[PDB]
Amino acid sequence: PPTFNPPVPYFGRLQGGLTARRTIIIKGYVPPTGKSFAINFKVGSSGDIALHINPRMGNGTVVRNSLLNGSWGSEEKKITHNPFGPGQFFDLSIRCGLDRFKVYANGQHLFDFAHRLSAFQRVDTLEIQGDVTLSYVQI
Numbered sequence: 235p236p237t238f239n240p241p242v243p244y245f246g247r248l249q250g251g252l253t254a255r256r257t258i259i260i261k262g263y264v265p266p267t268g269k270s271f272a273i274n275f276k277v278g279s280s281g282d283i284a285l286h287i288n289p290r291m292g293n294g295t296v297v298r299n300s301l302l303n304g305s306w307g308s309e310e311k312k313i314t315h316n317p318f319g320p321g322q323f324f325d326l327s328i329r330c331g332l333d334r335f336k337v338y339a340n341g342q343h344l345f346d347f348a349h350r351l352s353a354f355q356r357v358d359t360l361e362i363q364g365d366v367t368l369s370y371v372q373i
């Protein structure tokens with residue numbers, strides 16, 4: 235998929251895998267009629283999701299979880315701000331740290347997500363699906 239105006243669903247290969255210090259940029263638009271989209275940091279061969287980010291416009295929630303061997307873990311929903319309202323442009327920054335994913339939206343800290351798949355270098359797929367339009371995705 236291209237870096238600029240990639241269509242959804244976006245399927246991108248993280249070559250060498252998710253290494254520490256790896257920063258993924260997503261700039262995009264939530265349509266006015268959008269219900270939900272997902273960003274998945276996924277182990278393709280197994281289907282596992284180290285980090286799943288699910289903005290849901292219905293209740294204005296930003297749901298974080300992992301899918302590890304067909305099990306959805308505890309949901310993390312705590313935010314100080316929701317930048318994914320209908321008709322909103324967003325500049326999302328996702329850094330894979332040693333112990334935690336670190337996610338900023340429009341320069342403002344959104345959430346931390348402690349690693350659940352400790353072996354996160356096995357993540358080789360970035361996937362963006364659902365009610366989102368993409369202007370730029372940097373892997």
Ligand SMILES: OC[C@H]1O[C@@H](Cn2cc(-c3ccc(F)cc3)nn2)[C@H](O)[C@@H](n2cc(-c3ccccc3)nn2)[C@H]1O
Nearest residue numbers: 270271272286288297298299306307308309363364365
């Ligand atoms: O906790 C995060 C997940 O919630 C799922 C709903 N759900 C949650 C649970 C659940 C069950 C037990 C738990 F301890 C925790 C959670 N069971 N079913 C969504 O289907 C699941 N999801 C949404 C999507 C999705 C894909 C493409 C576009 C938009 C959404 N894919 N998977 C994800 O949001």
